[PDB]
Amino acid sequence: EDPKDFPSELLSFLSHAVFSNRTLACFAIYTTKEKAALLYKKIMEKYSVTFISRHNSYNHNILFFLTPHRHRVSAINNYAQKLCTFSFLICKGVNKEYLMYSALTRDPFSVIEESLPGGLKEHDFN
Amino acid sequence: DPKDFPSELLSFLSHAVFSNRTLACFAIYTTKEKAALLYKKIMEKYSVTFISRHNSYNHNILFFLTPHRHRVSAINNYAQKLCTFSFLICKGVNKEYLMYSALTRDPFSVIEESLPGGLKEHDF
DNA sequence: AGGCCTCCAAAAAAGCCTCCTCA
DNA sequence: GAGGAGGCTTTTTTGGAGGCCTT
Numbered sequence: 001e002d003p004k005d006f007p008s009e010l011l012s013f014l015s016h017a018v019f020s021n022r023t024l025a026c027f028a029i030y031t032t033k034e035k036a037a038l039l040y041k042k043i044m045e046k047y048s049v050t051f052i053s054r055h056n057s058y059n060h061n062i063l064f065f066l067t068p069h070r071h072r073v074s075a076i077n078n079y080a081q082k083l084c085t086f087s088f089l090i091c092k093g094v095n096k097e098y099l100m101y102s103a104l105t106r107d108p109f110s111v112i113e114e115s116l117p118g119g120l121k122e123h124d125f126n
Numbered sequence: 127d128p129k130d131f132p133s134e135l136l137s138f139l140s141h142a143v144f145s146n147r148t149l150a151c152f153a154i155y156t157t158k159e160k161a162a163l164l165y166k167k168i169m170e171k172y173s174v175t176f177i178s179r180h181n182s183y184n185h186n187i188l189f190f191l192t193p194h195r196h197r198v199s200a201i202n203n204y205a206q207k208l209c210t211f212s213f214l215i216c217k218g219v220n221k222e223y224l225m226y227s228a229l230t231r232d233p234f235s236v237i238e239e240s241l242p243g244g245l246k247e248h249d250f
Numbered sequence: 251a252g253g254c255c256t257c258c259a260a261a262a263a264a265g266c267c268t269c270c271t272c273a
Numbered sequence: 274g275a276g277g278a279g280g281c282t283t284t285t286t287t288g289g290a291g292g293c294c295t296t
Contacts, residue, residue: 020289
């Protein structure tokens with residue numbers, strides 16, 4: 001009954017790279033209200049994030065963030081998963097950033113917490 | 127806020143919306159703030175042969191010709207890209223001369239150009 | 251484990267050109 | 274002669290694979 005993956009619509013903004021060592025600097029997490037909440041702060045500090053924001057999604061929270069330096073998805077997932085014994089948690093690289101972020105702000109998805117107000121819509125992390 | 131480049135001007139701009147026609151003389155609407163900016167950076171991107179700002183209802187239009195010719199679209203990207211605080215309109219110009227003309231005269235005013243005294247007719 | 255990288259495939263964007271329809 | 278639609282080709286921007294290096 002817990003999500004096996006990200007919600008239907010978001011899926012195409014995301015990376016599917018199964019056989020690949022490319023690293024990147026934008027990521028998303030699907031998890032529980034509380035994990036998100038925690039991670040919000042944890043990741044911010046762990047990865048010196050250049051932006052981050054938390055969102056409503058099917059009575060679940062999604063985390064979305066940009067990093068000053070690149071990382072394997074594997075690596076972010078590894079950091080995330082250790083905070084997490086039973087609660088579900090899915091972590092993926094984002095390909096279409098502005099497109100992802102913007103969709104998490106237009107519903108079903110609404111914002112909750114967020115680093116800069118406005119988000120990508122208001123700053124170019126260029 | 128304006129929908130488009132003011133009523134009077136339209137007859138000289140392309141309002142084409144399905145064309146791959148490239149061409150080589152263009153325009154832009156913006157707040158003063160977000161306007162003088164491009165006046166420079168366009169030069170060094172697009173290698174321009176002329177350029178001219180204007181006062182346009184306490185706002186700021188922009189005019190220019192290029193050596194090689196371009197998709198309106200492509201320009202409008204290089205512009206939109208650098209600035210999407212505020213706003214920024216942009217079309218290509220079918221009637222080069224007749225544009226510059228009503229721009230440099232009333233109800234408008236030149237605020238700067240790259241050619242001292244700028245372009246007469248001849249030059250087209 | 252978790253960063254580095256080039257390489258191409260293939261899509262997206264940004265050119266060239268003729269046209270057809272206005273006049 | 275315009276000015277646009279759009280067929281077609283050229284150039285640039287992607288992101289998955291996969292091959293390296295450091296501890």
